[PDB]
């Protein structure tokens, strides 16, 4: 549910521009719970997931 | 068997090339190194035959040189190539920017007589310019790996936008840790002080990985860096600290001056 | 009305991000600036409502400041926004990488109270890393616009990979000509000679624009640069003149030595 | 011609097919001999008949 929405939102510029206009409305219509929406609005990436170094400089 | 390394960019799903996406789609097997589980779900849907390279990172707090992690990744990729699989390596962002796994795999692949290439992608650097409305051309651009900047001799140009990648492990010489210490970061500040004052505003930048996520653009004086909260994905932007001095010497040879500059 | 500047990448059709393509597709109007007519066609099939900015460039041996060229570009882009049209600027590569129009249009947009953003694209830089198989993080990276490096005081780190963009107009002050001269590029050779020997191998790079086209990767001594054939899309690469040397000063503060590096 | 390039640049199956056999794939898409000749000699002009930074 949550993952499906994010995938689409990232690809679909229509939906993206829809989300920018009214985030809560778009999210509620895609089935996101309150906790999920709350996490999004507070930017708690940690919780959302709940609900990167590939080199070095040692020569 | 063949090898194509691609990047998926930073943002989920939408920031990969159209061609790069197609490569994943048609691949016999995909070796992935992605930022999160949303990115890992998206990939699996795109192609179910995925091996997650993440596994080759130190597990359960074991001491392991990252060089060894990388070697294992490279070897796993080649194993598929050698077996005769049309193999695709999908790394987040640009697959050949501050990432050695793709360059090593390609290099080894060619030397073993396999077709191997790299498809450019969108990197954290590409994201930075856009997020902070900076054109790297305005006054030029410089990038270094933070630890290399400390361990080896690098002189920055203070008129340019300077970037220190992997700032979170700046000065971690063992390559067995995930982060560094405030002491290390303090040594960096004192080192940087050769060019930049202590109160020089710097920026902790983190490009978003999700579409509903805003980027981190935290401004602070250079001196405060050691106390700052850094993450493996954090990049340090050090904006110019100095005025451009006229290369009067060259303008003369050009037979012009500032007033003639269009 | 709204603004979104996107990048098309360098390669035809396939090197644009998925999200960025979707923006072109759903735009009310599109302002383009593409390398050729093949992409221009592709664009028109994506979205027929396109105004090609190329028209604002000097036409007919006309003396025009590139500045006055960009002014009109921005103005036109804004006109559509101020009309209430969901507008998009489709630029080649990364929309904000050595691209003044987009940044100027986003700024003017926001200041007039409109929604404006920049989506990162694959630049000529990103292409270079993948084509040459060079990771910018290896020994570091520096990028300057050729003319700016010749006009003002920039000190390069000769251990890094050094790029000079727009090398073809290097020293062209009036900003009216489409290319420079041999004597201009000769003065650049003498300038660079402060750091790089005359016989130092450099690389003239040109990322392909078509899928059937191979890139230009021409190696030559720095001395032969003034006789080289350069195109507006030519970037100059100058590999490190020196190898990385240890920074004993800082290693000491870290209380370590080379042998301690992982 | 312009139609082939658009496909090729987007489709990775077609790309890999081209890199196996450029001529066969091009001929299969109806390119002429002078068009193919132009590709193999890397002459982009014949096939076809940027500066936004200052200071
Ligand atoms: N989301 C992000 N925002 C900012 N910098 C990031 C980032 N993800 C990675 N980085 C930078 O890149 C380093 C990891 S190396 C991987 C880089 C990636 N291939 C790219 O093309 O960007 C981090 O230590 C940090 O310096
Ligand atoms: N196909 C190409 N190959 C190599 N360098 C290129 C290029 N296209 C543009 N450039 C570089 O960019 C300069 C123009 S500025 C435009 C750059 C573009 N925004 C990008 O994403 O790269 C040229 O003078 C050259 O230095
Ligand atoms: Zn760079």
**Pairing mode, if any, of strands C201-206 and C235-238?**
antiparallel
Closest CA to C30 of C51, C13, C9, C46: C51
Residue nearest atom 6 of ligand 2, based on CA coordinates: C233
> CB-based contacts of C95: which residues, under 8 Å, 6+ apart?
B130, C5, C6, C7, C89, C102, C118, C119, C120, C121
Taking the CA of C91 as reference, the closest ligand is 2
Ordered strands of the C2-7 beta sheet: C50-52, C29-33, C86-91, C2-7, C115-118
Instruction: For residue B21, give both structure tokens.
Output: 């996406």
Task: Say if residue C141 carries a ligand binding annotation.
Answer: yes
Cα-to-centroid distance, B125 and ligand 3 (Å): 6
B42·A59 Cβ contact <8 A? no
Give yes or no for a contact between C180 and C209, defined as CB atoms under 8 angstroms apart: no
CATH of the domain at C33: 3.40.1010.10
Measure Cα distances from B71 to A25, B76, B104, B105, C137 in Å.
48, 9, 9, 9, 18
Q: Is the Cβ–Cβ distance between C128 and C134 less than 8 Å?
A: yes
D34 exposed, middle or buried (CB, 10 Å; 0-12, 13-18, 19+)?
Answer: exposed
d(CA C255, CA C79): 61
Contact D54, C175 (CB under 8 A): yes
Any catalytic annotation for residue B70?
yes
Instruction: Tell me which residues of chain D have a C-beta less than 8 Å from any C-beta of chain C.
Output: 2, 5-6, 8-11, 15, 18, 22, 39, 42, 44, 47-48, 50-55
CA dist., res. B192 & res. C156, Å (int): 17
* Å from CA of B124 to ligand 1 middle: 5
Please spell the DSSP secondary structure of C159-206, one letter per residue.
TSEEEEESGGGTT--SS-SSS--HHHHHHHHHHHTTTS-TT-EEEEEE
Q: Which of B195, C211, C105 is nearest to D11 (CA)?
A: C211
Compare all CA atoms of chain D with the CA of B6 and give the residue at the minimum distance.
D12
C-alpha C16 to ligand 3 mean position (Å): 19
Q: Cβ-count burial of C256 within 10 angstroms (0-12 exposed, 13-18 middle, 19+ buried)?
A: middle
Of C33, C210, C232, the CB nearest to D5: C210
CA distance C217 to C236: 10
| D50 pocket-lining for ligand 2 (C-beta < 6 Å) | yes
**Which of C19, C97, C100 lies nearest to residue B129, judging by beta carbons?**
C97
Helices (H), chain C: 18-26, 37-46, 66-83, 100-111, 124-132, 146-151, 182-192, 248-253
Nearest to D12 among B19, B261, B262 (CB): B19
Domain residues of chain A, as ranges? 2-44
The answer to whether residues B122 and B136 touch, using CB atoms and an 8 Å cutoff, is: no
Q: Annotated binding residue at B166?
A: yes
End-to-end CA distance of chain B, in Å?
A: 55
State the Cα–Cα distance between residues B58 and B231, nearest whole angstrom: 17
* Spatial distance between the Cα atoms of B4 and D12, rounded to a whole number of angstroms: 11
Cα–Cα distance list, B229 to B35, B144, B204, B233, C157 (Å): 19, 20, 9, 12, 30
CA distance C209 to C13: 10
**How far, in Å, CA of B217 to CA of C226, rounded?**
43
CA distance C55 to C143: 29
Q: Is B239 helix (H, G, I), strand (E, B) or coil?
A: coil
Measure in Å the smallest separation between the Cα of C127 and chain A Cα atoms: 20
From residue B3, how far is each of C105, C126, D16 by CA, in Å? 41, 19, 11
Beta strands C235-238 and C161-165 are antiparallel
User: What ligand 2 atom has the least distance to the C-alpha of C91?
Assistant: 19
C142, C146, C148, C152: CA torsion to nearest 10: 80
How far apart are alpha carbons B75 and B81 in whole angstroms? 10
B184 is catalytic: no
**CA-to-CA separations, A11 to A7, B24, C11, D47, in angstroms, rounded:** 7, 16, 20, 34
SS3 state at C112: coil
What sign has the CA pseudo-torsion B149, B151, B152, B153?
positive
- State whether A7 and B92 contact (CB < 8 Å): no
Are D55 and B19 a contacting pair at CB < 8 A? no
d(C-alpha B98, C-alpha B101), whole Å: 9
C179 marked ligand binding residue:
no
What's the rounded Cα separation, in Å, for the pair B8 and B50? 14
What count of other Cβ atoms lies within 10 Å of the Cβ of residue A50? 9
Cα–Cα distance for residue pair B94/B108, rounded to 1 Å: 20
DSSP B215: P
* Record: contact C173-B127, CB cut-off 8 A: no
- Structural method: X-ray
Any idea which residue has 């292409």 for tokens?
C127
C70, C93, C168, best to mutate for ligand 2 pocket (most atoms within 8 Å of CB): C93
Distance B235 CA to ligand 1 centre (A): 7
Long-range CB contact pairs, B255-258, < 8 A, 24+: B256/C173
Q: Which domain holds residue B54?
A: 2-118
What does the block give as tokens for B180? Answer: 């560094």
């Amino acid at each position: 549910g949550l993952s499906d929405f994010f995938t689409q939102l990232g690809q679909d510029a229509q939906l993206m521009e829809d989300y920018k206009q009214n985030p809560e409305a778009v999210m509620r219509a895609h089935g996101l719970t309150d906790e999920q929406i709350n996490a999004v609005m507070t930017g708690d990436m940690e919780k959302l997931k709940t609900l990167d170094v590939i080199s070095h400089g040692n020569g | 068997g063949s090898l194509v390394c691609v990047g998926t960019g930073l943002q989920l799903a939408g920031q990969i090339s159209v061609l790069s996406r197609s490569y994943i789609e048609h691949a016999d097997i995909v070796f992935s190194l992605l930022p999160d589980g949303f990115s890992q779900r998206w990939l699996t849907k795109l192609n179910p035959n995925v091996i997650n390279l993440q596994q080759f990172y130190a597990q359960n707090g074991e001491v392991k040189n990252r060089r060894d992690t990388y070697e294992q990744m490279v070897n796993a990729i080649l194993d598929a190539v050698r077996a005769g699989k049309k193999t695709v390596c999908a790394l987040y962002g640009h697959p050949g920017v501050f990432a050695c796994v793709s360059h090593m795999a390609i290099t080894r692949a060619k030397a073993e007589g396999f077709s191997a290439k790299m498809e450019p992608g969108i990197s954290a650097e590409a994201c930075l310019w856009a997020d902070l409305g900076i054109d790297p051309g305005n006054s030029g651009h410089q990038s270094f790996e933070a630890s290399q900047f400390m361990f080896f001799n690098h002189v920055p140009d203070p008129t340019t936008h300077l970037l220190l990648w992997q700032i979170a492990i700046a000065g971690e010489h063992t390559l067995t840790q995930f982060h560094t210490s405030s002491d290390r970061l303090q040594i960096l500040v004192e080192q940087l002080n050769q060019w930049y004052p202590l109160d020089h505003e710097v920026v902790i930048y983190e490009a978003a990985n999700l579409p509903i996520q805003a980027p981190r653009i935290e401004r602070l004086p250079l001196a405060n860096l050691p106390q700052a909260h850094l993450m493996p994905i954090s990049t340090l932007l050090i904006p110019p600290a100095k005025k451009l001095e006229y290369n009067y010497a060259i303008l003369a040879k050009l037979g012009i001056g500032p007033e003639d500059l269009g």
